Amino acid sequence: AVDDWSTLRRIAIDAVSTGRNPELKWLADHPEGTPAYALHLADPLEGAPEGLRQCLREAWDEPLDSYVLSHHGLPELRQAMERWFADDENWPRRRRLLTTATMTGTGPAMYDLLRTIKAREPEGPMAALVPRPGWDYRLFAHDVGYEPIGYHVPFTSPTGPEPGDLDRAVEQTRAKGLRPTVLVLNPQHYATGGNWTPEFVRYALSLADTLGMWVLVDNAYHGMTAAGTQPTSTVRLALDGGFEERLIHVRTLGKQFACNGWAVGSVTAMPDVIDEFAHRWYPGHAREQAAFAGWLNNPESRKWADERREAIRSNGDALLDALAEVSNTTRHCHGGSPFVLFEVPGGWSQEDFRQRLFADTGVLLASAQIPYAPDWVKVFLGRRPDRFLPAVEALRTRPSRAWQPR
Amino acid sequence: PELKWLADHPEGTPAYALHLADPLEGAPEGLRQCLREAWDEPLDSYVLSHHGLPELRQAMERWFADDENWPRRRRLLTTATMTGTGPAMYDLLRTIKAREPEGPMAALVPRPGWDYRLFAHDVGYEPIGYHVPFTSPTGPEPGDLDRAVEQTRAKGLRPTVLVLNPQHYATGGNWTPEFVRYALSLADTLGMWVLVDNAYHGMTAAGTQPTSTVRLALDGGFEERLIHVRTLGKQFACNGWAVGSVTAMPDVIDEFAHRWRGFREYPGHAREQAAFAGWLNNPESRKWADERREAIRSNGDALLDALAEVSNTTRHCHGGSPFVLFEVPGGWSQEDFRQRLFADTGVLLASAQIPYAPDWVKVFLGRRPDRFLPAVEALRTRPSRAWQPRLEH
């Protein structure tokens, strides 16, 4: 019965404009004293696991407020992070890649990695091959001086692009007179729920090697596939295939541990690359770095992550059942990243639909943002069940004409 | 180089690292208490407002407007910064570029000064330095700005941005109202944006009145292209927290927040921001800041006294930003001097980095007296030949 309104008010309401996104106006107009549930972002508002917050609390009296004098972050965090991800992703022990810590988000990290690659490569016309739909890679690419070229990602298939989808992007890059310079992969895919095939990832890695392209793999959701799913590990496939020199792995700790605002993540690449990245393109936030190191070295973190994969599975099942009671549109729950997709009832468009649904039920859902299929909705599943299931209940019990085709 | 010396330092003797603008202290206890007490609140998520956490944006706007004596009525809007005022100035420079016609642009920056030239070059401005005299406690004169404008004109560049830093990193200067007024009126005539960095505004030695650029600007009507930037880090002994503020006209902040910052960074660090709002909204934060200006004054006096005891060179303590400057004895480069001094005394100092005066040292004063004064005593009681001239006429 516990909702999100008090927290949404604290983080989204202000006396000046809070942003251009429509949902911020809906929140500003939301009736005070009535429930509101936020399922539109991969961002659990109930907060981080207690074990992590306890690490932060217990160090309040330690001198952790200054600059951090290693540009790569605290060694204790670098080590605990590389350990946790290498185990999670079954990295081989025989590797030359080194791991550096990032403290202001992996968005900024991939922006500066695109600049790092650009600095290492001969000046010329540069394409970044990015998944479409996908996360925000195209925005960083454009601002750094690459033309972003989308490769098709089907949302109706649990298994992601086929090799021919990549080939078509390479062909369009050549037709535009550009060199294919970096390929972004995101096999636990934001935000279709896909878990791309080892077949396609191996194809992508071999094609990149043939073309001399860099491969940037974003593994934000690798550890958050629904229980019973086997996530494809790009680093394992790449190193076993002998593609290492131009591999860059990026992964936020925030999506993994319900703490997006902590902004701690990791970048793993060849030594010369992480050296240029960290020095050319002092850090801070030692309190977050010290707290994460203690948490990741605690076996409770692995237990909590395992339990969360089971919650993602059961949460999706519960949402699917509710959607079946209130609606008759197509639904997907592919299990590869923690999102459910469903089609907007006929005669509605997705924005009007979500606005009306939020007014009638208090449940705020997100546009799926699929460019070739705009009128689909996406629902994030990576929340504690005691905070996700009340939102499902509101959908199942509060009537709305949003569900009825026009 | 300095970090290397620190590593070869013998274990068993005190080392005092005074070469950074960082006290290597815990942040004020009240601030850390605010962080600790909120450990069980749900503050781990992204912030959904593109200005940062509302309670912090509001508290820091109020605290700075009081500290800097801003007029109560103004159209400027204040946003929070969550990744450093360096990235913020990078994004502000890009916001300005997007609003001006294309063509070659100069950014006028203080020389010596902070690293504004690095951001300006990166975004595609040519950085043009204006002379900042370090011997005067009041900094540049109007003709120093006029010279940079004429250099800009001779290179066929449009002067597009002027960066002002009146509590100056890192000379100690406190620039005069007359100079800042001249700079604002000249920028307005030329259509230049004024970016004022006020990192050290609240950090002047007690008894020194910092010049408030925003007050002078708004009194004179120079609002439309004014941008204020100010970190909380240097003042409140918490460089690692990367919380600060930017204030500009509403349309400028919106583009900065939505497009230039907003297409790269997602707002976060709600824990730091809530802790700062609790601190700034506590009367103890103002009391602590006042007590800190007294500590900066007494620290600088104590260093000057110790220098008079062990040395016979020119020294400055201008009182406008928390730095003491002094000249190395004859026959010493600044690097050899600081390396010898650190070896003999355990006290590590910084180069002043004055390009027209290389062999000078600077000393940051913003640290607790019970931690600064032991370093001063080390300089007095540990003999060093660094203080003796190595030249003879």
Numbering used by the authors:
A (entry chain D): 6 to 286, 292 to 416
B (entry chain A): 27 to 419
The authors write:
The biosynthesis of the lincosamide antibiotics lincomycin A and celesticetin involves the pyridoxal-5′-phosphate (PLP)-dependent enzymes LmbF and CcbF, which are responsible for bifurcation of the biosynthetic pathways. Despite recognizing the same S-glycosyl-l-cysteine structure of the substrates, LmbF catalyses thiol formation through β-elimination, whereas CcbF produces S-acetaldehyde through decarboxylation-coupled oxidative deamination. To understand the molecular basis for the differences between LmbF and CcbF, we solved the X-ray crystal structures of LmbF and CcbF with PLP at resolutions of 1.7 Å and 1.8 Å, respectively. In the active sites of LmbF and CcbF, the PLP is covalently bound to the catalytic Lys270 and Lys260 residues, respectively, to form internal aldimines.
Although the residues lining the active-site cavity are in comparable positions, Asn205, Phe236, Leu83′ and Pro302′ in LmbF are uniquely substituted with Tyr195, Tyr226, Tyr72′ and Tyr292′ in CcbF, respectively. In CcbF, His76 interacts with the amide of the substrate, and Trp140 and Asp141 form a hydrogen-bond network with the carboxylate of the cysteine moiety, maintaining an ~90° dihedral ψ angle between the Cα–COO− bond and the pyridine ring of PLP. The PPL moiety of 4 is flexible and located at the entrance of the active site, which is consistent with the substrate tolerance of CcbF. These differences in the binding modes of the cysteine moiety would allow CcbF to catalyse decarboxylation as the first step in the enzyme reaction. As a result, the LmbF-like conformation is thought to be a non-reactive binding mode in CcbF. These in silico analyses suggest that the active-site Trp140 and the Tyr72′, Tyr195, Tyr226 and Tyr292′ residues in CcbF play important roles in substrate binding and selectivity in the first step of the enzyme reaction. The LmbF-like conformation is not stable in CcbF due to interactions between the carboxylate of 4 and Tyr72′, Tyr195 and Tyr226, as well as the steric hindrance among the octose and Tyr72′ and Tyr292′. Interactions of the carboxylate with Trp140 align the Cα–COO− bond parallel to the p orbital of the pyridine ring, enabling decarboxylation to form the quinonoid intermediate. Afterwards, due to the absence of a proton donor residue, the quinonoid intermediate donates an electron to an oxygen molecule to generate the semiquinone radical and superoxide. Interestingly, although CcbF has four tyrosine residues in the active site, the Cα of the quinonoid intermediate is isolated from these tyrosines to prevent its protonation. Tyr195 in CcbF is crucial for the selectivity of the first reaction step through steric effects with the Cα-carboxylate, and the Y195G variant favours decarboxylation-coupled oxidative amidation to produce 9. Furthermore, the CcbF Y72L/Y195G/Y226F and Y72L/Y195G/Y292A variants, containing the mutation of Tyr72′ (Leu83′ in LmbF), catalyse oxygen-independent β-elimination.
